[PDB]
Amino acid sequence: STLADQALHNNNVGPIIRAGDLVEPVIETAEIDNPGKEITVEDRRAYVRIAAEGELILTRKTLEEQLGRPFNMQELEINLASFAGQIQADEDQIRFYFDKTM
Amino acid sequence: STLADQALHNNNVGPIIRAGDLVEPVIETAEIDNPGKEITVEDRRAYVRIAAEGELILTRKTLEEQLGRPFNMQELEINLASFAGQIQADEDQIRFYFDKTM
Amino acid sequence: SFESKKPMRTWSHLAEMRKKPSEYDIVSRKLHYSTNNPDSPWELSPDSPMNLWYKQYRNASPLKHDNWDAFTDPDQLVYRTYNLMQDGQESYVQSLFDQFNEREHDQMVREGWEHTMARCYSPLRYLFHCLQMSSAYVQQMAPASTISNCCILQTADSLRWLTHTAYRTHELSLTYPDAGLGEHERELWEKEPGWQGLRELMEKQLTAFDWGEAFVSLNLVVKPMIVESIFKPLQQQAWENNDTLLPLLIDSQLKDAERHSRWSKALVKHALENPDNHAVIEGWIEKWRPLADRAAEAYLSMLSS
Amino acid sequence: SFESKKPMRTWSHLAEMRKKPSEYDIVSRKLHYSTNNPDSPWELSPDSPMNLWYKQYRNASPLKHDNWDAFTDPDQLVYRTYNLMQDGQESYVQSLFDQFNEREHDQMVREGWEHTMARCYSPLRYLFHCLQMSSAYVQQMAPASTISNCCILQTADSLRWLTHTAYRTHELSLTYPDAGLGEHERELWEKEPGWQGLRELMEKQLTAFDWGEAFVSLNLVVKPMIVESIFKPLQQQAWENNDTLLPLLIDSQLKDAERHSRWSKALVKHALENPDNHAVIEGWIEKWRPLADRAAEAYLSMLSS
Amino acid sequence: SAFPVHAAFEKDFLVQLVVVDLNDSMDQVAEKVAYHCVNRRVAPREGVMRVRKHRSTELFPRDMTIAESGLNPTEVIDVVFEE
Amino acid sequence: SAFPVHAAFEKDFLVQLVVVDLNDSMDQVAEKVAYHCVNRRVAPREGVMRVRKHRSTELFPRDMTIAESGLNPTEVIDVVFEE
Amino acid sequence: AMHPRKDWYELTRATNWTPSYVTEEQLFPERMSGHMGIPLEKWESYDEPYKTSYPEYVSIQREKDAGAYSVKAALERAKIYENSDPGWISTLKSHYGAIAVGEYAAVTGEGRMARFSKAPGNRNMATFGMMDELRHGQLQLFFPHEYCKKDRQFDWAWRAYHSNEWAAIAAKHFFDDIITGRDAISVAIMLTFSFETGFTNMQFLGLAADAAEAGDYTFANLISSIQTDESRHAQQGGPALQLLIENGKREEAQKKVDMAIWRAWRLFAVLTGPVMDYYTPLEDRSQSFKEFMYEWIIGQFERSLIDLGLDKPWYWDLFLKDIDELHHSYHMGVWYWRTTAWWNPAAGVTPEERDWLEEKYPGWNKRWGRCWDVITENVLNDRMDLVSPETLPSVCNMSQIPLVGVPGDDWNIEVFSLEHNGRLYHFGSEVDRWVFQQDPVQYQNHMNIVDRFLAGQIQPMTLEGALKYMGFQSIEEMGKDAHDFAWADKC
Amino acid sequence: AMHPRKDWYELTRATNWTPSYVTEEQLFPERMSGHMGIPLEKWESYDEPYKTSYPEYVSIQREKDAGAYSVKAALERAKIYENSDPGWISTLKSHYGAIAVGEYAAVTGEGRMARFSKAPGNRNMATFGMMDELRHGQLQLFFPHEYCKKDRQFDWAWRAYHSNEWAAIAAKHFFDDIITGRDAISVAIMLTFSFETGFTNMQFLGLAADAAEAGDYTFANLISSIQTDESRHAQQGGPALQLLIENGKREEAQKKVDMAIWRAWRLFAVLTGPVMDYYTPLEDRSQSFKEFMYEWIIGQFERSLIDLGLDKPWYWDLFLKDIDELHHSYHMGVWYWRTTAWWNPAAGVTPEERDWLEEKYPGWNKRWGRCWDVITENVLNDRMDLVSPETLPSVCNMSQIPLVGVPGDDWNIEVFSLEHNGRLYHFGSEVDRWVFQQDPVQYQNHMNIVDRFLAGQIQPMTLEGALKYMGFQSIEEMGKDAHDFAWADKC
Ligand SMILES: O=[N+]([O-])c1ccc(O)cc1
Ligand SMILES: O=[N+]([O-])c1ccc(O)cc1
Ligand SMILES: O=[N+]([O-])c1ccc(O)cc1
Ligand SMILES: O=[N+]([O-])c1ccc(O)cc1
Ligand SMILES: O=[N+]([O-])c1ccc(O)cc1
Ligand SMILES: O=[N+]([O-])c1ccc(O)cc1
Ligand SMILES: [Fe+3]
Ligand SMILES: [Fe+3]
Ligand SMILES: [Fe+3]
Ligand SMILES: [Fe+3]
């Protein structure tokens, strides 16, 4: 359970984006909108797991800039295949976050 | 020019359908809507060349039946990548045809 | 031994069709495996609570047919084509909202119309949610997937209407902030006499648990009443009060309402293949019509005040 | 020798941008290679007929800027997003047509309104086609692809308006078959005094071959006149005659018209970076305004009759 | 008389249904189980096959019959080798 | 003095630009053309390389210079082998 | 202008009222609602974290489908069926069969909430949930349908839930327990939280990674799009759980989570486990089954469960041991009894594969490898009768899956039995027995396939009789080794 | 209710009127309109056979793009770039470079008709035509754009038409002649009829077949969707031709067709020919270049031309001989001078390939095979200096492509020259010279790349000077053998 305990005791939050046109823009957005957070990316080809410690924000304005075309926040659902963290979403941004620190 | 003359002297008319969901339904439609015409099909993977001698009709009603979902004749343009023959199109059918016999 | 067989062009259950199976046939037909075993609808203890529920409220319904699965949505709607159609209608309605708001439509309604809307329109969100809940119940209890599918789409349409009402209640409140718009609807639903017939009707309808009775009461009695006694009179009142948006909105909602009636009538026709069912359906209609009539009378009296 | 270089994240011409290039930047910018060689726009004999045409009507325009390519459509529309937007607006308009026809809107217009439409509305198809032709000319002559793209979409919008007019002319004729609807429009365009100012304006405008003058006359003079002197008065008249469809239709067309004005004004702002251009633009405006004013006066006199 | 049991054979991966006879000796039951295990998923080996109630510490006598054992139908047994 | 011609070499696939000298003999011109052809796209062979105006029937004398030939700049020539 | 959703959203879920013409309990019966006595007023604090509204839903969902169908259309000629490793084709067959009609059953779980939940936001999100599962069922019938003409096993995309085939019974026993067989709050907790935030990611995204490696983009694109809906409607569970805890029902909530997660685990161990570690070609295994479990269940789901204020399940350590062990045996069982499956299991034990297994599961070769050694030897000596069963496996009275353990050098196997109401039941784990004991009325008179065989319900009592009972309609539909034993050519 | 298009369509094209404030000739100048003196009234009988209307257009075109982009998105990770044969990647590079900005130029040809054609139906169909070509230019910039970050040669999708690279000049000389450089009626005949019903099918559908065999569905799906637009707007030409013939302009119409078809042929012989018979991997050659020509140009296009009442071109027999011969030499030229291309040509002469070529073109090995024999020998003996040029090829004053013939055993090569206005021009065929003579003012002062080199416009006068002149900005952008000569390992 050493391996298991260590897997459980993480504070990684953030989107899992399915393969498509949102992968690179979401990665770039995570980096830009969370300065002073390290962004981790695990590439599984069909999807990419993107994470930061404790909290990761994606703003509509930044995502639109990185994607390069008009974008409404609700459209992210087309490519948001899963996520780590609790979610708080509105017209301006999505926030992935934890209440506890493990 | 034997080979060339023989290639030129054909009366083949009909649609070239690009790879997708219209290929099989158009083939079936050509067979059904032109009884007593032999329908030829050449499969080039990216497209299929479907032909009859002199005239080949595709009706909206039959195409809709073979495709299995509501269908307007104008939608065929989504998958009609080329055609042999002159074309006469309306809301009810498309007709591919020649004026001359070679 | 077994026989050796070749591939079939479609599902084994459709393979005997004359016609080439449609998208609708392929994805809609004969999906309730819960009707296969009369003693045990669900793969559990035969007397588990939900198995007992289904044996009583579905299997034992006096509304009987040997092949409910053969029912066909006359519109043959599937999820994909429903969304195409409703994105069309809903885009259109949202475009109306945008354009009428740009033209400041609400400011030009007849004196006092905001109060009529607050009392007679905004609390519709309760009525429409009841239709939503009730539609979902017919969905989960109906004995064929083709029937349930019509109910799923109808549940969604009910939420569409609720949402229209919520949006316009809020929007109207922007021009008329002192009419209780978005504030007093629960009180009206609970206490206003004009709403009490409707509320009594729906609370009782939501407790008719037999699938057949649920369907008849909802789709043949309640919903047609709403069309003739709520939707259309509201259109007439709006016309008399220079509200030109409401009639257009309601016309879009009526398109949904006529679709619900179309599939309902098609189910009735299917059911009537069994002559016994005429007395059953007519009995349930006669049972609920008094409640529905009183609901409409009370609502109309309120609307006319 | 050459230098060894690594891959660029975008086109070489965009590589110095601070920002990540957008869809618009990638597919719209610096595509007219015909501006590269001043002596030979096109890859032919330097004095071929079309090379002579472009050297005179584009390159030699008094409207001058050292970097027309830097122009940006403020809406940053591309083919893909134009179709999304216009499918939205057009679906909406077609839905209005369907719904108003269902409600028999045309039968309830004020007595005689069909004759006003026959005379003042249906011949708009000629005016709108002239705008279509003229827009296509600015497209083919403009010295930057970003400018031409705005013109392509505007050419399409002009055909959209023409098509609206054609459809409604025919539809109106179904209720009013004895008003010359769909029969007498060419005669009116050619002979009716109220149309002659407009016709004279457009025939002359279509023969202003300098790209700069074509643009100013079309987009800064003619098109704004149409908005204020044709589109809006028609809305007022329709209101006075219980035509409730026409104002909604025109509002959708006005959305296109305001978009054309937006990009036009943005081009002007870009041009005005060169101070010499103010006198040039103002000169062309002063030149054409008299014609445009007479066109509007004549049309309004006819509309008011 | 037919007598169903569920039997786990030593070194196999599962428990299987094996129908034995009311009058079978443990030696015979052990044989009927082995049939469905040895040379299928379990290597043959030297030694005496023994029967015990599942997870039990006590082995049944080799000559004892299932009747004499007191086992009930559909109860679980292990077949193992003497150590 | 530099003198551009366009030369087709026997058995090659194209015509190429070869700049010769106003005072070159046909033997030398034939050499300058061969340079860009033989051992590149044409197999070397025994025999005397000759020059003729394109598609002409007459061969130029081997000792004749391009000056003496009357050829104009950028005219086309063939380089072929005696038969 | 248009007004932003935040300004009018509350009115869309302002739908609770105080019943007057019937009682609150009549309108929301406990057996269908599961409100645990919590009054209506308390449920109004329910706040769905992943919201949508009707206009956005139809527009967005239209776009999702247009992409799914367009990709399928453009790839029809990619020769996936003809050119894919047969282990991958079998993966498709078992997915569509085990999933498609279950997705449609999930419409009923959502419907149960849309009618019977006391929380207004839950009733609305459940309405979109009904629509989502309708989409999923229709997509996953439509996609495999084109393959009917190639292979009768694809008929099972539709037929499976209509059959008594053993795996279909295992699927139905599970889904009827967590989806269609309980009250609305139980659905919220067991289905939307436990199953839909917890396990489905393994089959719809873990598998999608393998599908992309295998070059099957039609399928990977399909299931990943499906999971975008799951991600939204699954978020109905958390707010229900938080509300139960706030209202003094933590123990009851925890028990339902613990139960649903174990039940889901046993099913995925037999469906997804063999797919990931055996059927999927070695070159296409993005990660091992255990690796994906540690990513999706431990690293993601369990951490989220803790964040919400729940505890690790009591059976945690058993669960971890099981991840190392169970699917290797479930795979062995499915393969040995392959003839009762509607897909063709790949053995997955070429020397190259066994090296990978040993690396991913140290000790594998001295355990399961011992059985595969015997099997392989028989195959190389053409003793094929020894690679087909002549009896039934013993089956769990909860999971409906054979009773297994660890074979080979350190053999260990345990069955957990229970006498109850004059009947003897057998379970494949401590937890499965515990699940039964949590709610005996749900299970006590259910008979598993072996119970039925012994009761005389399967006639004749032979392999053929059983295969017929399970719904097989021809020789071709019954499972065979995926490569027709060509893998022995590598041994 | 809605009224059917047939009931209102005539009003959409009832737009001709009799000018009063300017003259008909002022409004429709011959140099821009090309009406050949035919009065307005005669043009009203123009009847476009492939109609559409604004509402249908935006709706349909929205659907076409959604599929094109969705497929691209779903396949981004299919490793096409990394895993494809480099001959296929070069095929993509030469396509996007030669086509993308030319598509955008075609907007101007359509625009010329939309303003200047006297036929009302032509002006409307040309409006949709402008929109179609805008789509095509934007798609074919957008798609290759993602590859910029991998390979500077992809920059040429945008840069090519901005360069003086020899193939870009050949492309521009052609498109500026048939698309942007002539009157509206000439555009209708040369572009929409000749080029767009005649030749584009080779590059957008013939190539799509090869792309599908190569497993590049993003590209095959893209170009086949593009060609669905072509099929509609190309149908503006036929009704123009029929009208000209009815109005006594058959000879003038025939000459324009004859000219445009030959010009198009020479370009496709250098672009599409090498792609189909050499760059595309042997296993992916659906048919040979000649086979595709016989399907698309002879069997389909030429038969359609006859049906409309036109005659086979005077140069028919020369054309047929050319199909057997020209591209084999154009390929050899592009490859030997590969360093001046923006793509990496594949030699395509492994023994297996040469057997295929011999089968598809009996006698190939005793012709082009003779040159490839010398080249191959040099490569095997590492005499690499002999596989790179030290001079310019002679270039056609019409096509802008090197002057070639048949090499080897039955060597034959012919240049067709012309003195005109004190200048000496050289043409690669009888027809190319004839084209020049049909309209000398169009061409007479044009200078091809070799004319410019000789005139002193290219400095310095060396390979490096020329490469710089052509716009190459780094070593990496210049063409090399596609497999870096790895193909010799098979010889
Ligand atoms: O039954 N099933 O297989 C399901 C049910 C629901 C769901 O979201 C996914 C799969
Ligand atoms: O694997 N199983 O669970 C099975 C296999 C075969 C059988 O007859 C019954 C159940
Ligand atoms: O393997 N099986 O599933 C079996 C084997 C034998 C039998 O009598 C019944 C079922
Ligand atoms: O210039 N081009 O390459 C083109 C132009 C037009 C067209 O339809 C296709 C290709
Ligand atoms: O192939 N060509 O046409 C060329 C090649 C090289 C060159 O410098 C000029 C033209
Ligand atoms: O091969 N080439 O294109 C060349 C070779 C030599 C030279 O001086 C100029 C161009
Ligand atoms: Fe689902
Ligand atoms: Fe789900
Ligand atoms: Fe094009
Ligand atoms: Fe085109």
Side-chain angles (χ1 to χ4, degrees), chain E residues 4 6 8-17 35-36 39-43 52 54-55 73-76 80, chain G residues 329 332-333 336-337 371 374-375 378 385-386 388 390-392 394 403-405 407-408 411-415 426:
Chain E
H6 292 104
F9 192 95
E10 183 173 26
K11 296 190 168 196
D12 208 350
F13 84 102
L14 87 173
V15 188
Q16 287 170 307
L17 172 72
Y35 177 87
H36 297 284
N39 288 329
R40 295 181 183 262
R41 296 173 306 273
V42 174
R52 64 171 183 214
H54 190 236
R55 312 284 304 183
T74 81
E75 284 181 350
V76 188
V80 299
Chain G
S329 283
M332 187 169 298
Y336 200 84
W337 278 261
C371 300
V374 177
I375 288 160
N378 287 138
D385 57 305
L386 298 178
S388 295
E390 297 172 35
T391 192
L392 293 167
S394 312
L403 299 174
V404 299
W411 180 60
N412 185 79
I413 186 157
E414 188 166 3
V415 180
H426 299 294

Side-chain angles (χ1 to χ4, degrees), chain D residues 72-88:
Chain D
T72 299
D73 177 5
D75 282 325
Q76 292 187 210
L77 283 177
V78 301
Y79 180 85
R80 185 185 69 80
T81 56
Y82 174 91
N83 289 151
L84 290 173
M85 174 183 70
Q86 295 305 74
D87 190 36

